[PDB]
Ligand binder design. Structure first.
Ligand SMILES: Cn1cc(-n2cnc3c(NCc4nc5cc(Cl)c(Cl)cc5[nH]4)nc(N4CCOCC4)nc32)cn1
Lengths: 826, 248, 332
């Protein structure tokens, strides 16, 4: 068996959702921001936000909504986790003591159901009579909000329309009514149904189904002054209520997809819209009152306000300030001005909240030579893409290097006092027949530049047809200085060539240090690319020189330096190349029993391979023979996101389901099969998507050595910006920390009453297993925050039978000392 | 796809045993002795008639690829029965077959099994499987004797006499190389034909085609009387050599 | 007959062993390439080293059953090979034998367990039609494949589907009853009668397992997941209805009927809980997941069903595989 420890070094920073209401008091205006597994509660002020409380939940926050039922003074909070943990939460403050009360709890998972494509949707009735959940295709789940339903039990209504895009509870109806845009073979349609709690079924809906745009995205519930609903698409915005039909198709919104919607005027007169290039719009509902006293909608107008961060959620706080919640870039506070500035913008940034954004690759390097270690990340997307320099110093100090384009992979070349970074930028087919970039970015703002002139793939006589307006990715290698982070050089790869892999190394007897890039020629028709290059560059005297290129018949997804030779994955193949005295790559040996060899790591002559569905495989070079040999494989099928080698016998993997596992050699060589079966001895639900595993530590080091109970350091970056650390334990320390956990779980009160053991259980749509071999360091480290009696309740009867000595009883101040030593590893 | 398991009578003059100096008379006696050993042992163990026949067919095939001098008869028979039991889902432990063998065989005869009877048998299994080219499925005249009899309609007692007499002839033909010359379907017809002549029954009257004098043609296509007569002659020869009279 | 009819005289030397791919019925399965032809084959190892019964009787059954069966939806045994054999030392020869099968590109366990593949209704038709055509072939030859699981259903990238491991399979005789093992299928796919202890069972055991798979292809989650026989019986009862004399006359005759009872006598909710499944398929699921084996549909009846009756093998439809989403979950 194996024993490992996992802690958070940086909490999730990406904003998954934001709501405004009256949660902490009926008087205050609150902004509840949701990051993965983290809820942040703020109080709106005239200058900005005042933080008041932050809790963690044992679950990914999927639905977060505020409502106020009749008989309550202040808003209540509904949260549903991605594992279908549901709860209703209330804020309670006793002077200086702030607590979140769990009013209701339940798990709403169905034994049978198909998870929907557009994900979990949760909506609440305007009269707060019921909570609507869209969890599965063909089903609508209703939790009625009666006082007695503290168990949050629910029933399902059959839904004829299987593929639902979005749904909202409609305003102004005589009964609970839902409006949803759905897709069948005839296109998309918007339809309505009435919800009857008494009959537990749908009745005929108020207004008829209409045929709507095929790319209809969101349903907006218009408040009672107008009533009805607005449907946002890619090219058209439509308001449907009864017989009234209004449709605007402004030419500005066709340029970029709209991803967020929010209401400014409670009247429904004004709405905010956001697109994927950061633009912020205002949707204005012109009002026409009839002499009958009744208000009809005259026309719809969309006005461009300015540029924000590419935002997942927009939420307007009063007095003209809007919180831009972003997953791909920094979140923001902005001011909407009545008068435009001299550039034509009505939007001016107030504050910027750091978001490590999507961390696609990272490398650990001690640039200042302090011996400490700093983490350089490829973080952000599109205009919000950046490098981040992260150092420990009690908070993390983070420097941001805007690239204004998408960063892909990073590697450090010390000989050149610079980094190599792969990047891609979006250009649109323009009227010249070429392409034009929307914004200038790192690859265009380089001091010196070059373009590949390779003739390898020039064999196609005719180019693939290009029509104006189509997006294309343009890939570059960026040479960036390690002190100034100036883009010293940019190399642009061939048209339709993607840069997927990057290494900095010396090969063979060649004293030169090279930047080596692996690429794939990506054409929309091809399911899997069938052309690609390995390119050897030398960065010398401010210019990148192409040294050698090797044609390969696939995508070079990963490359790694292996004992002076080049190890590369080309589609299903894993290949080893030698670097000849003629400065060319020569094939030595190949291995083909893979599907998609997406991740490679090495240690000595041993190679760890990560495959799309066949989990992890251990290969050896076998130097005498000169051929690869399969040593052992993990036979439990998994879809990998990143892999890492912990030691010669333990291997770490990350699943696309937000799970971590550790495989080991069976260590009992009875039969050759036992040796060949890699055993999954560690299982753990992380809750984050790990893209990059990387050996090292940011801890400041002053000859501090072997004081730690933990052995090893693996850092990992995630999509939500979370940075974590995995380390190994001895059997003795593990059981101490494992037994302590079971005690802390009985003592510590969970938000929503979520069982910790459930949360960390390995979970795919198909499997749920109890966690094994992993210590939730975030649980252990919370021991130093629970009150003193709770500490003594936890240390009670706790005996540590470490071995090589008899069970010794534990003391509370001794355990506080252990955890304080453990907090020094991050 | 599948191997051929049928030879022509002329070819038996060139079995490996014949070519090592064994004469035709001796080889047939060795086969009768070995088949009946396989028969007698299995009957003691309570084995189904198909299990006995399968063992015997392996044995007959085996000594078309190997010599009796080089491989002892009774050991081979035990190995055939042991494997036949597993093939036909009537398994026996090797030790029980060895035990039963000493009871039925004398001291010289059980000497072939050597100092360790079980290993000598169990070792031969590999050579048996390879020699039979792993063609384990075997069909036997019994199933056809019954399939064809079921389609006869008439005097219940005369047909039952036909079947039992024919069934006995099937059991007796296992002592011969007929299993290597003709497919089981032909054997079943031949024994029906032989039983009829002996009982003086005219089988065509019991068929759906009572004026089709070549009654067997509706069961087995393309069989000349030449073949049925050859088979009958070979069966009755066993009876005349031993001088026992037809079962009747 | 000249060649390809002589089995067991060839050595495993003619095959280079790539590695091991999974665990089968009684031994691990390996992958190889034939040196002469270059073909990829699949090998299962039969070892004779235990002399208690010499050649495994279970292996002998897998060889007898499989060589009789020839179908486009049934995996073909190519040949049987042996280890280097000593000449004139055949008495000391401890060499083991290997069973050679055709190699198929993917296995349904790996595709679904990862979650990468997506089955459309038409894809599910191409899958179910082919599976049952093979199962009908085997059931007509009166053989029972007693280990239907996602690891024994293999598919090629063409869309052809084939059944695989016949080492846990045995012959069936309606007239003559031989007792067989009450625990024979993966619990998640086990027929109810074998849970209640039926030692002499019908070929309807296989139809139940494939019915569970039919739902799994539409739900993307196995229908009945439980770690204990009683818990599985409870889960089956909640959906298919509790075993009752009205729905199953001879449930009273089964050994554990009084011993093993569900919490309540639940009613059948199969159609309600599977309302999202197409009508043509739902009726098939209802008939296939019928409690009483005497009322559970046959393999032929599935092929003469509205869902599968009109399916065309010409339009074989391979399950869908993602492309650049494999490298990156789409940010848009
Ligand atoms: C009784 N019998 C079986 C076969 N048989 C033939 N072809 C395969 C085959 N081919 C797809 C395939 N699945 C793979 C999984 C991995 Cl991890 C790797 Cl590396 C390579 C793979 N190839 N799979 C399997 N199952 C073995 C057990 O685990 C599930 C797959 N049996 C197979 C032939 N006779």
């Amino acid at each position: 068996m194996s024993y490992n420890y996992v802690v958070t070094a940086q909490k999730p920073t990406a904003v998954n959702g934001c709501v405004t209401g009256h949660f902490t008091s009926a008087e205050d205006l609150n902004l509840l921001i949701a990051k993965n597994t983290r809820l942040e509660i703020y109080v709106v002020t005239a200058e900005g936000l005042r933080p008041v409380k932050e809790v963690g939940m044992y679950g990914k926050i999927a639905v977060m909504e505020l409502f106020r039922p009749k008989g309550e003074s202040k808003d209540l909070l509904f949260i549903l986790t991605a594992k279908y943990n549901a709860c209703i939460l209330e804020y309670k403050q006793s002077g200086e003591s702030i607590d979140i009360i769990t009013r209701a709890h339940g798990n709403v998972q169905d034994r049978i159901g198909r998870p929907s494509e557009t994900g979990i949707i949760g909506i609440i009735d305007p009269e707060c009579r019921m909570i609507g959940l869209r969890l599965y295709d063909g089903l609508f789940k209703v939790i009625p909000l009666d006082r007695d339903n503290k168990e949050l039990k629910a029933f399902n209504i059959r839904l004829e329309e299987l593929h639902v895009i979005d749904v909202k509870f409609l305003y102004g109806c005589q009964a609970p009514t839902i409006c949803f845009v759905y897709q069948d073979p005839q296109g998309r349609h918007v339809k309505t149904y009435e919800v009857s709690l008494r009959e537990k079924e749908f009745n005929k809906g108020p207004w008829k189904q209409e045929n709507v745009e095929a790319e209809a995205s969101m349903v907006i519930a218009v408040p009672e002054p107008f009533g009805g609903a607005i449907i946002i698409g890619q090219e058209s915005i439509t308001y449907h209520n009864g017989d009234k039909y209004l449709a605007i198709a402004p030419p500005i919104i066709k340029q970029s997809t709209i991803v967020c919607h929010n209401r400014v005027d409670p009247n429904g007169s004004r709405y905010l819209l956001g697109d994927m290039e950061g633009r912020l719009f205002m949707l204005l509902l012109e009002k026409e009152e009839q002499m009958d006293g009744t208000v009809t909608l005259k026309d719809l107008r969309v006005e461009l306000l300015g540029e924000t961060s590419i935002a997942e959620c927009l939420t307007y706080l009063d007095n003209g300030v809007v919180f831009v919640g972003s997953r791909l870039g920094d979140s923001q506070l902005v001011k909407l001005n009545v008068d435009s500035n001299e550039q034509g913008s009505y939007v001016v940034a107030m504050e910027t909240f750091t978001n490590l954004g999507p961390i696609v690759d990272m490398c650990v390097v001690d640039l200042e030579r302090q011996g400490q270690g700093q983490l350089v990340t490829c973080s952000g997307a599109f205009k919000e893409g950046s490098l981040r320099i992260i150092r420990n110093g009690q908070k993390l100090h983070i420097r941001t290097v805007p690239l204004y384009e998408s960063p892909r992979k990073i590697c450090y070349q010390e000989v050149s006092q610079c980094f190599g970074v792969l990047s891609s930028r979006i250009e649109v087919q323009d009227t010249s027949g070429g392409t034009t970039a929307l914004r200038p970015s790192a690859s265009t703002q380089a001091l010196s530049s070059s373009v590949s002139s390779s003739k390898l793939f020039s064999s196609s006589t005719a180019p693939h047809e290009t029509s104006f307006g189509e997006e294309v990715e343009v890939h570059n290698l960026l040479i960036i200085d390690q002190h100034t982070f100036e883009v010293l050089h940019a190399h642009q790869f061939l048209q339709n060539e993607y840069a997927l892999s990057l290494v900095s190394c010396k090969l063979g007897k060649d004293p030169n240090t090279y930047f080596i890039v692996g690429t794939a020629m990506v054409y929309p028709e091809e399911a899997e690319p069938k052309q690609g290059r390995i390119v050897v560059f030398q960065y010398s005297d401010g210019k990148l020189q192409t040294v050698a290129e090797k044609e390969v018949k696939g995508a070079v997804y990963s490359m790694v330096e292996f004992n002076g030779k080049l190890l590369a994955s080309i589609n299903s193949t894993v290949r080893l190349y030698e670097w000849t005295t003629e400065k060319e790559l020569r094939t030595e040996c190949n291995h083909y029993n893979n599907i998609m060899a997406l991740y490679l790591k090495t240690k000595g002559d041993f190679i760890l391979v990560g495959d799309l569905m066949r989990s992890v495989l251990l290969l050896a070079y076998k130097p005498m023979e000169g051929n690869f040999e399969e040593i052992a494989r993990d036979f439990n099928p998994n879809w990998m996101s990143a892999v890492e080698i912990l030691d010669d016998d333990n291997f770490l993997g990350a699943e696309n389901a937000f799970n971590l596992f550790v495989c080991q050699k069976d260590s009992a060589a009875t039969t050759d099969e036992e040796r060949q079966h890699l055993q999954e001895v560690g299982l753990f639900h992380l809750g984050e998507f790990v893209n990059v595993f990387c050996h090292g530590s940011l801890v400041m080091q002053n000859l501090g050595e072997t004081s730690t109970p933990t052995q090893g350091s693996v850092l990992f970056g995630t999509v939500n910006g979370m940075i974590g650390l995995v380390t190994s334990l001895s059997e003795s320390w593990y059981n101490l920390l494992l037994d302590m956990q079971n005690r802390l779980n009985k003592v510590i009160k969970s938000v929503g009453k979520i069982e910790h053991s459930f949360w960390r259980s390995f979970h795919t749509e198909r499997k749920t297993e109890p966690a094994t071999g992993f210590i939730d360091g975030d649980l252990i480290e919370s021991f130093l925050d629970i009150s003193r009696p709770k500490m003594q309740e936890v240390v009670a009867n706790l005996q540590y039978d470490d071995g090589s000595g008899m069970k010794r009883e534990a003391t509370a101040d001794d355990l506080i000392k252990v955890v304080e030593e453990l907090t020094r590893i991050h | 796809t599948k191997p051929c398991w049928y030879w022509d009578k002329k070819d038996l003059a060139h079995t490996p045993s014949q070519l090592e100096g064994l004469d035709p008379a001796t080889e047939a006696r060795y086969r009768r002795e070995g088949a009946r050993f396989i028969f007698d042992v299995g009957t003691r163990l309570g084995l189904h008639y198909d299990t006995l026949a399968t063992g015997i067919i392996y044995f007959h095939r085996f000594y078309m690829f190997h010599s009796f001098k080089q491989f002892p008869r009774y050991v081979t028979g035990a190995c055939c029965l042991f494997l036949a039991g597993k093939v036909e889902e009537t398994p026996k432990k090797c030790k029980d077959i060895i035990k039963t063998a000493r009871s039925l065989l004398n001291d010289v005869q059980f000497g072939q099994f050597g100092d360790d009877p079980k290993e000598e048998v169990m070792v031969l299994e590999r050579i048996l499987l390879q020699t039979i080219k792993f063609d384990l499925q075997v069909e036997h005249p019994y199933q056809f004797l019954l399939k064809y009899a079921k389609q006869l309609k008439g005097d219940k007692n005369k047909i039952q006499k036909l079947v039992q007499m024919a069934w006995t002839f099937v059991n007796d033909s296992l002592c011969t190389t007929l299993s290597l010359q003709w497919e089981p379907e032909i054997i079943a017809v031949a024994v029906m034909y032989l039983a009829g002549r002996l009982c003086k029954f005219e089988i065509q009257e019991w068929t759906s085609k009572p004026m089709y004098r070549r009654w067997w043609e509706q069961f087995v296509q393309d069989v000349p009387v030449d073949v049925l007569e050859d088979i009958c002659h070979q069966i009755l020869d066993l009876y005349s050599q031993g001088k026992q009279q037809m079962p009747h | 007959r000249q060649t390809e009819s002589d089995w067991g005289k060839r050595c495993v030397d003619k095959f280079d062993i790539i590695g091991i791919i999974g665990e089968g019925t009684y031994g691990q399965v390996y992958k190889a390439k034939d040196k002469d032809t270059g073909e990829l084959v699949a090998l299962k190892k039969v070892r004779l080293d235990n002399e208690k019964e010499g050649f495994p009787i279970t292996a002998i059954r897998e060889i007898k059953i499989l060589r009789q069966l020839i179908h486009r939806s049934v995996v073909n045994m190519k040949e049987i090979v042996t280890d280097k054999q000593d000449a004139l030392d055949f008495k000391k020869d401890k060499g083991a034998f290997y069973l050679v099968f055709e190699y198929m590109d993917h296995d349904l366990m790996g595709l679904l367990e990862s979650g990468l593949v997506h089955f459309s209704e038409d894809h599910i038709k191409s899958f179910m039609k082919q599976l049952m055509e093979g199962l009908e072939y085997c059931h007509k030859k009166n053989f029972l494949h007693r280990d239907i699981k996602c690891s024994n259903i293999l598919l090629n990238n063409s869309g052809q589907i084939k059944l695989a491991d016949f080492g846990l399979a045995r012959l069936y005789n309606s007239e003559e009853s031989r007792p067989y093992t009450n625990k024979v299928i993966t619990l998640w796919y086990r027929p109810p009668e074998l849970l209640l202890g039926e030692e002499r069972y019908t070929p309807a055991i296989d139809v139940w397992s494939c019915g569970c798979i039919l739902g799994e292809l539409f739900t993307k989650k196995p229908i009945f997941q439980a770690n204990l026989e009683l818990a599985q019986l409870e889960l089956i009862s909640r959906l298919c209805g509790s075993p009752c004399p009205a729905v199953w006359p001879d449930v009273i005759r089964l050994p554990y009927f009084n011993t093993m009872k569900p919490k309540k006598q639940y009613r059948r909710r199969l159609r309600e809980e599977f309302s999202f499944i197409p009508s043509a398929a739902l009726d098939l699921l209802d008939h296939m997941l019928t409690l009483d084996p005497s009322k559970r549909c046959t393999a032929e009846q599935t092929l003469q069903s509205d869902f599968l009756k009109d399916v065309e093998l010409s339009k074989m439809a391979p399950p869908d595989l993602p492309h650049w989403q494999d490298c990156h979950e789409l940010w848009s």
